[PDB]
């Protein structure tokens, strides 16, 4: 249930100019990547709550859900958007339920038991909670980088792929005291340029950085102490939507008994169950792996360039989040305390 | 794609396959090794009883120190040759 219904296009444009501009930029890939989409969505939601007028909590909920449904459809593999929505949707619901009775266990026992002003100018409170999200989205790299003194130790060898500001902040923080080594597999073709830049920044911090091709990942794996990866999103089954080639690191690590550590903020955690990987994996342009000026080659061969890679939930050993370090088995409880499990489908 | 250069002059340094002297007794209104050079032709009908791959010729361009005095560069080449102290 989107916002194309319950509102016209010109009404959306006038009432919610941010929604219109976010839809356009999500489709045009202008706003891109987990963090950029998270922040922008949260700001757009601040406008939605500020502009929208309702007398009932339910109107507010479905209004947000509708805007959420539309923003999601704009760019569905940027899970960061919907997560911010689901976060606010829950924020609305229990701000309501404590306002519900200031005016005074298990789901297994629900099978046996009892059958069967609220909504407006909690806006001022809602907007505050939205700002609380903005603040938390800033502390992610700081809340995570600190934990590097419990896993990164001197003379250890670490393998990383592509580029992750989280992982980078994680490494460099430990690196300003302890001296270790990092092998950076570039994320060719996609995370290529970014990883080289990160590799240089690491070396400038004195971390003894080695840049290898993606085909070298297995060969050096035998001497690696630990794998530390970033991710684009964490799905409902605890799986990993991450950047291209990351399964090469994952599979090779499991084959060499090397632990896989994932550094990610909780906001990248999405309840979307991967009933599929085909709908998950997006494909960029073949231009990245093959030049268009190869006239004979491009007219005679299927040329594919996946943007993402998937990693099964049981290939990750540890999640380093802003909340702390947790096993993949605990992601279940992380969600049920963050989203409301009815907004899983937006 | 072809790169054009009138910035270049021949250093009269050449090295040929052996059969090029079999391209120097029989065919010969040939001139000068710079008259020679051009009619290698690698393209079109080019009929002229060749004997055997496909023919090919490469150029190589330096950065410094190589040219020749046929003209009065002798004045300049001589001047150019004073890399000495004592």
């Amino acid at each position: 249930g989107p916002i194309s219904e319950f509102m016209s296009t010109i009404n959306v444009e006038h009432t919610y100019p941010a929604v219109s501009s976010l839809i356009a930029d999500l489709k045009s890939r202008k706003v891109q990547g987990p963090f950029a989409v998270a922040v922008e969505t949260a700001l757009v939601m601040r406008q939605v709550i500020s502009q929208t007028r309702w007398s009932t909590v339910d109107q507010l909920i479905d209004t947000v859900r509708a805007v959420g449904s539309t923003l999601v459809k704009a760019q569905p593999t940027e899970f960061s958007c919907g997560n911010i929505i689901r976060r606010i949707l829950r924020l609305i619901r229990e701000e309501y339920q404590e306002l519900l009775k200031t005016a005074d266990y298990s789901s297994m026992l629900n099978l046996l038991g009892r059958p069967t002003t609220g909504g407006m100018d909690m806006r001022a409170v809602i907007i505050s909670g939205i700002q609380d999200v903005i603040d938390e989205l800033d502390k992610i790299n700081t809340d995570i980088e600190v934990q590097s003194m419990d896993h990164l130790h001197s003379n250890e060898i670490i393998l990383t792929q592509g580029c992750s500001k989280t992982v980078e902040a994680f490494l460099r923080f430990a690196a300003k005291k302890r001296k270790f080594s990092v092998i950076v597999a570039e994320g060719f073709p996609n995370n290529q340029k970014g990883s080289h830049a990160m590799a240089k920044r690491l070396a400038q911090a004195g971390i003894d950085t080695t840049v290898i091709s993606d085909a070298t990942i297995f060969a050096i794996m035998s001497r690696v102490n630990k794998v530390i990866l970033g991710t684009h999103a964490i799905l409902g089954n605890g799986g990993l939507v991450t950047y291209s080639g990351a399964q090469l690191v994952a599979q090779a690590a499991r084959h060499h008994a090397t632990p896989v550590v994932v550094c990610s903020g909780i906001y990248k955690l999405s309840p979307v169950y991967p009933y599929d990987l085909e709908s998950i994996i997006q494909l960029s342009s073949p231009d990245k792996i093959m030049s268009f000026n190869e006239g004979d080659l491009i007219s005679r061969a299927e040329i594919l360039n996946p943007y993402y890679d998937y990693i099964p939930p049981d290939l990750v050993d540890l999640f380093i989040t802003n909340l702390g370090g947790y096993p993949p088995s605990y992601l279940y409880r992380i969600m049920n305390d963050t989203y409301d499990a009815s907004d899983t489908i937006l | 794609r072809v790169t054009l250069n009138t910035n270049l002059s021949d250093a009269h340094i050449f090295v040929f396959k052996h059969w090029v002297i079999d391209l120097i007794r029989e065919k010969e209104s040939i001139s000068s090794i710079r008259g020679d050079l051009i009619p290698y032709l690698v393209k079109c009908q080019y009929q002229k009883s060749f004997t055997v791959a496909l023919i090919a010729k490469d150029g190589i361009i330096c950065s410094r120190a190589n040219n020749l005095p046929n003209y009065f560069e002798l004045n300049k080449c001589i001047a150019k040759l004073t890399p000495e102290q004592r």
Binding site: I10, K27, S285, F292, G295, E302 | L4
Partner: protein
């Protein structure tokens, strides 16, 4: 930087003219998306803030779409206005007229027809700008795309020989590639002031030109100029315009091409099914469709029901609400919304637009069927066909070899009803 662009629609309108009788050319769907939208997305990417669309044939329906479009909204990156002038405009005519209005402010983008591209012209502009900043007699820089000479996307028009100063990137020679022209004749004077030149037969002439504010006035003057390449470029080079310089920007990434021919329409469209012009790809759903990408480059909208024992093969796009019959084959084919394919058919390398109905036991291939066309049963169609504006074909008929149908009043053959051509619904 306030940037503007001039889009010459209606230009190649005559090429697609069994079509372009109901709709205009710029409203024709490439892959279930009107060609004008690709142009708009490209300009929006370039950072254009002001758009002028020259048009005539169905200029009303064009102006209507633009009025009801994505680009008439408050969020729209640019402001699109339309210009209606007497049909069959040459590029010069539009530019001369453009001068009489003093519409052109600063540097602008000039494209003819419809352009499908993802090349960010941002850096091409700054290159063009700073080049003018030092010398103002540089009036145009042509965006061209690197390629191979025999390249598939490099056609008759795109096949041209360029000679560019390797350091200044200034075009000192241009000549279109015609048959019977066996040579490249340069005036030896170029060589004593440009000295590492590069002769290039590998380029794709996209004819996406970044012109300066002088150019409209320069077309008022030299009133004999009609084609932007044939006359203007030739003029600057052979010095009809005395002191002007033009440059090339050979792009080495992305995509650029224009939909001008019927064959280019086919070429570009499948270059679009391949992810060559990302994110401008069917499953990006810019006009709020519901496309999804699947392996072997098949694109499907929602609400599409497939019969079992149906075989949709590679490079196939299916619009929403489209149904396919039992034991039918669809391979490498564009299909629009609300089509219905009969059972036991074979469609290969064809084009089906909205509301097209196909009977049973049909052999369709290499063909364009325009909206609302309905085909009977056991009817065979063949390559080069084009069936426009709801032309109806009845049971047991054969159609072939580039024949262009219409339901209208003009030159191409054919009319509607039961068995058509022959048993004609018009007689001629």
């Amino acid at each position: 930087h306030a940037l503007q662009a001039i889009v010459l629609s209606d230009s190649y309108n005559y090429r697609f003219r069994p079509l372009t009788l109901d709709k205009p050319r710029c409203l024709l769907p490439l892959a279930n998306t009107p060609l004008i939208e690709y142009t708009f997305e490209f300009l929006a990417l370039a950072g254009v803030q002001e758009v002028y669309v020259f048009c005539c044939a169905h200029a009303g329906q064009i102006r209507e779409y633009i009025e009801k479009s994505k680009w008439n909204l408050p969020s729209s990156p640019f402001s699109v206005n339309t210009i209606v002038s007497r049909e069959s405009l040459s590029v010069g005519d539009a530019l001369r007229e453009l001068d009489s209005k003093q519409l052109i402010t600063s540097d602008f983008i000039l494209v003819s027809g419809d352009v499908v591209s993802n090349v960010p012209l941002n850096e091409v502009l700054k290159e063009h700008r700073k080049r003018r900043e030092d010398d103002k007699n540089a009036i145009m820089t042509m965006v061209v795309r690197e390629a191979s000479p025999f390249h598939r996307t490099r056609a008759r028009t795109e096949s041209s020989v360029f000679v560019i100063d390797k350091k200044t990137s200034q075009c000192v020679h241009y000549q279109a590639n015609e048959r019977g022209k066996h040579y490249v004749s340069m005036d030896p004077e170029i060589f004593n002031e440009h000295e590492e030149l590069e002769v290039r037969n590998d380029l794709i002439d996209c004819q996406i030109d970044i012109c300066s504010n002088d150019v409209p006035a320069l077309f008022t003057e030299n009133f004999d100029y009609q084609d932007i390449r044939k006359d203007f470029v030739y003029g600057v080079l052979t010095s009809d315009l005395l002191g002007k310089k033009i440059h090339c920007h050979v792009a080495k990434e992305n995509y650029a091409a224009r939909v001008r021919s019927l064959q280019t329409y086919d070429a570009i469209s499948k270059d679009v099914l391949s992810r060559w012009v990302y994110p401008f790809v069917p499953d990006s759903n810019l006009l709020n469709q519901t496309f999804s990408y699947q392996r072997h480059q098949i694109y499907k909208e929602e609400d599409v029901v497939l019969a079992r024992s149906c075989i949709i093969k590679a490079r196939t796009l299916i619009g929403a609400y489209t149904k396919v019959g039992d034991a039918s084959v669809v391979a490498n084919t564009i299909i629009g919304r609300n089509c219905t394919i009969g059972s036991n058919c074979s469609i290969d390398s064809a084009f089906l637009w909205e509301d097209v109905v196909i009977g049973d036991n049909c052999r369709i291939g290499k063909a364009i069927l325009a909206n609302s066309v309905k085909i009977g049963n056991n009817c065979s169609i063949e390559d080069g066909a084009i069936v426009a504006a709801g032309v109806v074909i009845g049971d047991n008929t054969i159609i072939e070899k580039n024949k262009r149908l219409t339901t209208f009043e003009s030159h191409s053959q054919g009319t509607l009803n039961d068995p058509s051509l022959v048993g004609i619904g018009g007689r001629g």
